Amino acid sequence: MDIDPYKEFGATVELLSFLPSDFFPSVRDLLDTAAALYRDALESPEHCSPHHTALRQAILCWGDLMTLATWVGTNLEDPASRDLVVSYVNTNVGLKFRQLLWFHISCLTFGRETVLEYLVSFGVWIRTPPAARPPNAPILS
Amino acid sequence: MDIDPYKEFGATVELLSFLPSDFFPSVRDLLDTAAALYRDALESPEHCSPHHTALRQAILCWGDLMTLATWVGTNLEDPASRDLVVSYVNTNVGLKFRQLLWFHISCLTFGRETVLEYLVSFGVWIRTPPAARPPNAPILS
Amino acid sequence: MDIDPYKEFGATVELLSFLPSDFFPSVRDLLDTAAALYRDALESPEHCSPHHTALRQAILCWGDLMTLATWVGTNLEDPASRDLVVSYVNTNVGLKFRQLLWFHISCLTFGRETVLEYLVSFGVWIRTPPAARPPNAPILS
Amino acid sequence: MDIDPYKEFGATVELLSFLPSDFFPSVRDLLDTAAALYRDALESPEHCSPHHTALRQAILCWGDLMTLATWVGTNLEDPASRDLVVSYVNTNVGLKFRQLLWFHISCLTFGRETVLEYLVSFGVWIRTPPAARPPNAPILS
Amino acid sequence: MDIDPYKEFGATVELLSFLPSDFFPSVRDLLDTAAALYRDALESPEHCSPHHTALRQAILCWGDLMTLATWVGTNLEDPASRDLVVSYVNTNVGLKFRQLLWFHISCLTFGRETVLEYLVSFGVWIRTPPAARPPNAPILS
Amino acid sequence: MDIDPYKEFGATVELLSFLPSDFFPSVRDLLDTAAALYRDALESPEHCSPHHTALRQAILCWGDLMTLATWVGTNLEDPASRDLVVSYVNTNVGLKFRQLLWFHISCLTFGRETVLEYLVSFGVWIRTPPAARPPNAPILS
Ligand SMILES: Cc1cc(C2CCCCC2)n(O)c(=O)c1
Ligand SMILES: Cc1cc(C2CCCCC2)n(O)c(=O)c1
Ligand SMILES: Cc1cc(C2CCCCC2)n(O)c(=O)c1
């Protein structure tokens, strides 16, 4: 199967990649934010939205990878192999979760279409060279 | 956060664990089944159901976990740890995906309440010793 | 005192012993089943039934013996003596708890009189030699 | 499961622990008292009350725990562990049965609410230092 | 700032010191009593009273000192320095918390003015030499 | 007991921790501010508000913690432990008092709901990278 997790939400993997990697917050900071803003609704027994259902699975999969790292470190008593697995996750998969977490959190706070219009505006703005581009970047509040 | 991926779908992790792990199909067989029955709807740009949204994220995360296992199998220096980490990924996180994939596929084909009634009936049936239990097990339809 | 825990529930220790010991599920499997079917009612602040009150005390006494084993193993640092205490419990008292747990769980799911009629029917059936006895045994279901 | 044997009887483990352990009678003395006051009803084929059902299971489990202690005292090879395991059974699980036996006997003789009001009054009284506390302690009526 | 924690409650540090230190229960016993009598209201989301607000901060500060002791003992692996910090707390600050805990608990159970009248009566009584003073001391109730 | 000092005031420990620790003023500066703005009311014999009662206990407990730190700095024999225990008191328990002092001062000057709305807005703002976030941060007034 060729599945795009953004496709049912009016976006695509390409559109998210349009933003530079450095622009996304850390996974840690996005999880703290998900809690801060939406802990009650995430843990609730209501399908509040597709964004909520998407966020739940993503948070639990990141959860599984962190349980694996801890398990390797303490249960296998092998911190070296632990450090390699953390390094592999952060290098190879961290960006994907950063994009996905940011996208679904941003979509809930600011609204879906606002986040889309913001991806195009910011990518244009950032690519425009410093001299040419307006000093005040596009904002979502 | 304490999130339960089954909680928004009227179930829980405990209820799913009530079925013995050996009685779930393989991940490979569930993915082929997901395709066989629902490839068009999974790949579509419509939020067909929370089951569809849940399945999409799970199917995509499994890809990443299998790339991790392969990577560990080639790249992990310590022979003691390596085979254990591959085994843990394939079987221990494998069981979670087997439960989740089976649950969401079963819920779409046969209906949510049918799947729930079936979990309780089968767990009781399987635990009942051979002599005591009916010869014909409970059937999903 | 000569107390029979089955006497207030229309049965006796003799009637329960009428079933072969091999016929009962494991303690572990009966506790998982008690949870699966009745966790909410067991933990509730209502005397739902004498079966519930009986189950609560039995589950907690098994609980106490398992806390003792763990305590011997980890707190006294003596796994050898741990293994002897587990072995003593499983050979000497496990059958009693298996009979009692099965009885009170079976009485709640299928109804008290049904379970009684089933004890007599099954004991007769199992004692009748293989050649002579019907192929389909009595079923509680 | 998190089961509280006092919860269905309007109390909790915390409330019972509010009384110092030294102020409960011996298990032996509570069993003799249970007999003295209620032998006929305990041994009867009627569910006289939840207190009666609770008492029956507790009295029967104490028998098993005392057979375990005796067995450990003769059969446990390791002298360090043996005396500690006997001591743990007699005193540490002994306190639980002392609390539970006293509670259910006291509830039958004096009434449930009277026993509850008495737990709070006595715990306050005993903790208040000799100088500060009234000479007449609370009495069970 | 010169702040008196008793001043807003119609008392002072001097008036509390009027009672001998030996008269107060242990911190441990007052915390168990605070729980026993008021766990629900202390943990609740209502400002039940200034006594409740005062008690919450005091219980949490004692909590912080006990987390420090544990941290020194286990995390710094230094039980010696642990023993010195516990000794310093118990000799230097324990009386203050004993006075404050007793005061706010006593004020809630027996009423504020009753506790005040009781401080003066008891201090007079205790200072009156044994021969001269009534045999029955003043009682809180 | 699980007590939250913010729970009575419509907030929680999690919500306060949402702000980075570095963005709170020093304890010294918050105490000078508490004096500057509210010395008369804090030292007064009126329960002006729950915020005032909370502040009084916290300000008095900080005194005791600073006497402990000084005492450890002169009197703790083990050089390894001593600097770590002073550092832990000043920074780690310091953060708790910084959060609590700031919270209760901010609640009195600007109003409770304003402070809450400000915690969420600022945490979001600070976590969102410079490029994404508005140049003007949220302001307390
Ligand atoms: C765990 C489990 C799984 C199934 C499925 C196994 C294979 C696919 C369809 C049913 N069943 O029938 C069980 O009883 C228990
Ligand atoms: C918990 C408890 C129990 C008793 C009973 C022990 C024997 C039966 C009557 C009292 N007393 O006297 C207490 O103070 C406290
Ligand atoms: C953690 C923290 C603290 C403050 C206060 C710092 C100074 C006192 C008033 C606000 N602010 O403004 C933040 O954004 C974050």
Numbering used by the authors:
A (entry chain A), B (entry chain B), C (entry chain E), D (entry chain F), E (entry chain C), F (entry chain D): 1 to 141
Sentences from the paper on this structure:
The nucleocapsid consists of the HBV core protein complexed with the virus-encoded polymerase and the viral DNA genome. Early electron microscopy (EM) and crystallographic studies showed that the HBV core protein assembles to form two differently sized HBV capsids that consist of 180 and 240 HBV core proteins and have T = 3 (~5%) and T = 4 (~95%) icosahedral symmetry, respectively. The core protein forms a dimer as the building block in assembling HBV capsid. It contains an N-terminal assembly domain (residues 1–149) and a C-terminal viral RNA-binding domain (residues 150–183).
In order to understand the interaction between HBV core protein and ciclopirox at the molecular level, we purified and crystallized Cp149-Y132A in the presence of ciclopirox. A 2.3-Å resolution dataset was collected, and was subsequently refined to Rwork of 25.8% and Rfree of 30.4%, with good geometry. As in the structures of Cp149-Y132A complexed with other assembly modulators, the complex with ciclopirox consisted of an asymmetric unit made up of a closed trimer of CD dimers, positioned in a similar fashion around the icosahedral threefold axis of the wild-type HBV capsid. The crystal structure of HBV core protein complexed with ciclopirox shows that ciclopirox occupies only three of six possible binding sites in the hydrophobic pocket at the dimeric interface of HBV core protein due to movement of the F23 residue and proline-rich loop 6. The binding pocket was formed by hydrophobic residues L19, F23, F24, P25, Y118, F122, and W102, with extensive van der Waals interactions between ciclopirox and these residues. Y118 in particular played a key role in securing the ciclopirox, by forming strong hydrogen bonds and salt bridges with a carbonyl oxygen, a nitrogen, and a hydroxyl group of the pyridine ring of ciclopirox. When the hydrophobic pocket to which ciclopirox binds was compared to the hydrophobic pocket at the dimer-dimer interfaces to which ciclopirox does not bind, it became clear why the latter pocket cannot bind to ciclopirox despite the fact that the two pockets have very similar shapes and share many of the same residues. First, the absence of binding of ciclopirox causes F23 to rotate by 142 degrees and to place its phenyl ring into the pocket. In this conformation, the phenyl ring of F23 directly collides with the pyridine ring of ciclopirox, thereby disallowing ciclopirox to bind to the pocket. The second reason why ciclopirox does not bind to the non-binding pocket is that the proline-rich loop (loop 6, residues 128–134) surrounding the dimer-dimer interface moves ~2 Å into the binding pocket when ciclopirox is absent; if ciclopirox enters the non-binding pocket, its pyridine ring may clash sterically with P129 of the loop.
